[PDB]
């Protein structure tokens, strides 16, 4: 058992014109892709350093595990958090959860926004539901550092703003990328992640 | 595998009055011992996560590996390093090679006390060799992240400057403990870890 590039559940132009087809093909085919077989090479050489106890192979191990693994998570959980059936807002405990812990949906947005547009270099912003303190809560991870593996935060919603996320399309205008994903996340999905975390 | 805490190559008090008994019986069975216990329950861990692919627990264990782990590493060298038949001036290669990259062996003195004073807060202060350049150089580390893991740079001579390295005896004032460890380096050890690395 090795981790695989996942199929997007969605056709590469389904997402225009918000995220055209030429960045969906890049992202997952070659971004996404290199992710993975780099995870899987650089899992197999920490087994034989594990094996070998050798502490300092390990070690520099870390910043590839970290970023190629980091990276297989996140993408994993974007190509899910968007859909050509996406937009508008959530709907039930979500939406309520939203509403209590920032205010108001649009409030949440512009929240989300500041901390995505706010990232200085690579990075991604992030939804996610805090276990311990039973709410909702977002973060900005540098580089592809996941939400849960330095946080403890579930993602609920991540939003790539790394460069090759949206500059084909609009260039060095960030925001713009950010205006526009808004209409294509899928709360339905969203809504499971926040779901299973309550019971 | 299993990592164990390597017996000291003499007894706690063999390099007073510079780190006294004190401060080695606790470096040595409390600290070091942790490093150990701890990176041995950590890695145990990881090989639960890669054989069940969890990646998010690899990259939430890579704080802990990295402490406890570079903690073995730093201090299984430190010990070697010192040496109650230690001081006094390197001969041979080691003394030709710190002459010409330092100027002399006071001037690379000053500048290895300097790079370990200068660390604020945790760390250590390396001696090491860079294999690409076949000469010396002097770096600093923060925290137990180990020099040759993170840099490449093969260690020769380490210095703690931890502040349980050095509290109890010498309390603020780290520059007394640094001029006083001069007088118990194994310089033998440190041309073994040269030479090794070295024509
Ligand atoms: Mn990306
Ligand atoms: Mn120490």
């Keep these: 058992m090795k981790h695989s590039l996942p199929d997007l559940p969605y ?37 034989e350093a594990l094996a070998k106890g050798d502490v300092t192979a390990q070690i520099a191990l870390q910043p590839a595990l970290k970023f190629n693994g980091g990276g297989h998570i996140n993408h994993s959980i974007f190509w899910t958090n968007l ?15 939203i509403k209590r812990d920032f205010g108001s949906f649009d409030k949440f947005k512009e929240k989300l926004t500041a901390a995505s547009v706010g990232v200085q270099g690579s990075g991604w912003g992030w939804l996610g539901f ?21 946080t403890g935060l579930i993602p609920l919603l991540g939003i ?12 060095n205008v960030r925001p713009d990328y950010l205006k526009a994903i808004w209409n294509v996340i899928n709360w339905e999905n969203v809504t499971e992640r926040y779901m299973a975390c309550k019971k």
Tied chains: 1, 2.
């Design 11 to 47: 056709d590469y132009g389904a997402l225009e014109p918000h995220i055209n087809a030429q960045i969906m093909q890049l992202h997952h085919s070659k971004h996404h892709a290199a992710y993975v077989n780099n995870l899987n090479v650089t899992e197999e050489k920490y087994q």
């Design 83 to 97: 859909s050509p059936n996406g937009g508008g807002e959530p709907k039930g405990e979500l939406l309520e959860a």
């Design 130 to 150: 805090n276990k311990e303190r039973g709410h909702l809560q977002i973060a900005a991870c540098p580089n592809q550092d996941p939400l849960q593996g330095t």
């Design 160 to 171: 790539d703003v790394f460069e090759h996320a949206y500059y084909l399309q609009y260039k």
